[PDB]
Amino acid sequence: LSPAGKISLQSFTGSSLVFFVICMFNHYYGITNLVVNTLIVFFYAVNVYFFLKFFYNEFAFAIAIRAAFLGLVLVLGLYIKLVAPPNIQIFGGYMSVMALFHYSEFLAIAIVQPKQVSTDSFVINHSPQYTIAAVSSWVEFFIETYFFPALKAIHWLSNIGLCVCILGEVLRKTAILTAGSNFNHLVQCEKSSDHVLVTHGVYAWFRHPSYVGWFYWSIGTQIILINPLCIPAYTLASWMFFKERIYIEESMLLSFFGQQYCDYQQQVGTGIPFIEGYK
Numbered sequence: 001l002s003p004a005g006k007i008s009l010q011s012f013t014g015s016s017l018v019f020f021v022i023c024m025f026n027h028y029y030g031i032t033n034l035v036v037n038t039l040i041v042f043f044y045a046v047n048v049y050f051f052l053k054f055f056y057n058e059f060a061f062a063i064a065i066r067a068a069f070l071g072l073v074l075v076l077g078l079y080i081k082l083v084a085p086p087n088i089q090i091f092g093g094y095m096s097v098m099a100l101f102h103y104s105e106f107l108a109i110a111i112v113q114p115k116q117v118s119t120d121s122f123v124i125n126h127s128p129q130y131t132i133a134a135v136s137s138w139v140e141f142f143i144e145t146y147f148f149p150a151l152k153a154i155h156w157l158s159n160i161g162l163c164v165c166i167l168g169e170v171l172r173k174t175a176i177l178t179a180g181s182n183f184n185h186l187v188q189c190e191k192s193s194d195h196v197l198v199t200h201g202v203y204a205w206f207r208h209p210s211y212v213g214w215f216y217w218s219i220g221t222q223i224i225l226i227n228p229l230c231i232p233a234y235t236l237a238s239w240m241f242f243k244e245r246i247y248i249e250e251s252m253l254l255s256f257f258g259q260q261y262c263d264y265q266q267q268v269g270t271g272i273p274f275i276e277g278y279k
């Protein structure tokens, strides 16, 4: 694929194979202490940084280091979900889901839109809104697992969350592909000359498929963690953001394609419950 896409793929799969071997080694030799493992991974994480910043300039490196980082989170998440106590095993899969999302997000953009593929398509979360909401679900899981370890041992539930996450993902990406270059991480106010309307595939089902996938995936994140507090909070925060965004995004869509979209509004719902769009 595009150049900025091959860098991420090699950095992601590469970092995921380095620390996978590391995690394999630490298992077959009974290396079980938490501070020792943290120090080994830290050791080799340092290694990957300078091997990458040596082989890459500022652009390709800020791309590579993020790719490999997610790879790290990936391997470490599965590692925790396999060898951590059953009080914690849930948080491992959660980590893995998160890493995959943030990576498959960039890779999707690099494919369908190699032109504008940056570190924001890697989309490390530095958006003051999400960061607070993300870390806040962690502090609830560990406080509820410390005081209520049993709550985090119901593995059929957390697997249900995994399910809704994988689905929301497939819909998300399958929508980013279906839309092609028309897709955009940001809402557009001016019309491109190659921007046409999409109504087939997943868009035949929803006016905002990706928003649907991202919506249920986000809810599934807290269904995995079995956080009784973050599940409702995430559902509401996600809902309102997609209400405003879907609203304005549809208004611009109305001045974009006029009646085609007014007909598309009469023919397909937004995809999220209780969001009408721009009527």
Ligand SMILES: Nc1ncnc2c1ncn2[C@@H]1O[C@H](CSCC[C@H](N)C(=O)O)[C@@H](O)[C@H]1O
Residues within 6 Å of the ligand: 175, 179, 182, 183, 184, 185, 186, 187, 188, 189, 196, 197, 198, 199, 203, 207, 208, 209, 210, 211, 212, 249, 252, 253
């Ligand atoms: N139905 C549609 N067909 C083609 N382009 C669309 C579209 N809806 C929004 N867009 C454009 O793509 C950008 C948002 S991408 C939004 C995708 C959609 N919410 C989903 O979940 O699948 C907006 O700037 C808009 O200009």
